[PDB]
Design a protein around this ligand. Structure first.
Ligand SMILES: [Mg+2]
Ligand SMILES: [Mg+2]
Ligand SMILES: [Mg+2]
Ligand SMILES: [Mg+2]
Ligand SMILES: [Mg+2]
Ligand SMILES: [Zn+2]
Lengths: 69, 114, 135
RNA sequence: CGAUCGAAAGGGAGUCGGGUUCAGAUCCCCGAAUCCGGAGUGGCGGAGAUGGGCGCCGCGAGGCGUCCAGUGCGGUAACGCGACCGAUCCCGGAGAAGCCGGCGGGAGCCCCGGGGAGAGUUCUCUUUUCUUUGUGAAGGGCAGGGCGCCCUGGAAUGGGUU
């Protein structure tokens, strides 16, 4: 597993060709965005509920989204 | 207290059959078979008892994986000889080469008068 | 008598450039407040010119005769002074002590060392300075 | 320097967590990795590397034309940075090392004081007794441990220290 510190590199890893899926985990005091690539599961950790919702619209349209529960 | 068993068929406590304890997400204690401890390279001078610095201590076939900067020090004889015996060999190589020039000069000094 | 002079050829004993020859361009025999030890700014060579012989082409000689230089401040006990001296110009307005803040000025200090060292090497003088120390 | 054979306890790169059967699980399923080998077109990105002088032009911000350089960079140093050409040849290291004593660190287990959850006793007493109360490999960061590593400086009224 790899942790992406920034938001800008998360968009490139989601826009990779080998990004099989993206999944959103909604727990307390944290929002987790996980992109399943060929080698690693890249995780973006957001502790801002406003930026989580705008990024959720800001995902690329060609990627398959699985909102976890 | 949960007594635990081996996970392989080797039931003897040999050097390759070395384990350590590990706590698991299923809340139980397992054996994890450890790797042997690595050693840093010894200096090529042959006198320093300490091992070299700046080089990772791994098993010899792990050095295939590692990049070059993890395997040497950016210096002449770097990652193979210690800096003390590098500078003490620089001084030696300079000084004996100087003394050979002195002997060559003193040869011609004798041949000039004789 | 003091011998750590701005014409003396020294050997570097420690660091990346260990075993390589340098010329002192500015000695500081009593330490500055930032460097309390006695030290010297030198300007040496990184990559020695290769062995050039006869029965070779003229464009190949210019390829083997390529000197890469370095500019560095050294402690005295990390230097090995020699009896040899070279009378290289090395104007001090470009090779000096606040070179080590701007990397572009360090590029120009290394360039000015390099052109003078190549010019001195192509005259067949100070030939001990341009052969590598075999250790 | 002798073909070849010779260890399911020696050497030997690299897999762990959950779940699953009537009987198999580091092997099946799910989820996370990792080692080795392969590549003409080399799949991409990054590095090599895009710098300076002179002569014009542009008010400048900067732009064309010549002459060159450029197989990386930083730190006094121990050495560090994501790479950082190079063969035949040579040198060295790892693999690769006994037995015993003492001490220190880190785990696991045990121990004590409380919070929960569920049980046991309650004829009398007992805020009581019992069970349970967590996180893999690999990566990154920080404790902690070790150094026969470096720089300054020169110590007797000798100090440091187990
Ligand atoms: Mg074995
Ligand atoms: Mg753990
Ligand atoms: Mg290193
Ligand atoms: Mg055999
Ligand atoms: Mg075997
Ligand atoms: Zn040594």
């Amino acid at each position: 597993p790899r942790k992406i510190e920034e938001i800008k590199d998360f968009l490139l890893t989601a826009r990779r060709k080998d990004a099989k899926s993206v999944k959103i985990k909604k727990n307390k005091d944290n929002v987790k965005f996980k992109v399943r690539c060929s080698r690693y599961l890249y995780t973006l950790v957001i502790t801002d509920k406003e930026k989580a919702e705008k990024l959720k619209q800001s995902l690329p349209p060609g990627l398959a989204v699985k909102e976890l529960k | 207290v949960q007594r635990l068993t081996y996970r392989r068929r080797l039931s003897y406590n040999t050097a390759s059959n070395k384990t350590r304890l590990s706590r698991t997400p299923g809340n139980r204690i397992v054996y994890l078979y450890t790797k042997k401890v690595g050693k840093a390279p010894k200096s090529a001078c042959g006198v320093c008892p300490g091992r070299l610095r700046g080089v990772r201590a791994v098993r010899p076939k792990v050095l295939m994986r590692l990049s070059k900067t993890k395997k040497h020090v950016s210096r002449a004889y770097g990652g193979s000889m210690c800096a003390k015996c590098v500078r003490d060999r620089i001084k030696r190589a300079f000084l004996i080469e100087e003394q050979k020039i002195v002997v060559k000069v003193l040869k011609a000094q004798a041949q000039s008068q004789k | 008598g003091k011998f750590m002079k701005p014409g003396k050829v020294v050997l570097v004993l420690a660091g990346r450039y260990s075993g390589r020859k340098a010329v002192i361009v500015k000695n500081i025999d009593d330490g500055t407040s930032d460097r309390p030890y006695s030290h010297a700014l030198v300007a040496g060579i990184d990559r020695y010119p290769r062995k050039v012989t006869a029965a070779m082409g003229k464009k190949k000689i210019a390829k083997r005769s390529k000197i890469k230089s370095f500019v560095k401040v050294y402690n005295y006990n990390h230097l090995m002074p020699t009896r040899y001296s070279v009378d290289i110009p090395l104007d001090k307005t470009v090779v000096n002590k606040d070179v080590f803040r701007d990397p572009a000025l360090k590029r120009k200090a290394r360039r000015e060392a390099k052109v003078k060292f190549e010019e001195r090497y192509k005259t067949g003088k100070n030939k001990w300075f341009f052969q590598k120390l075999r250790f």
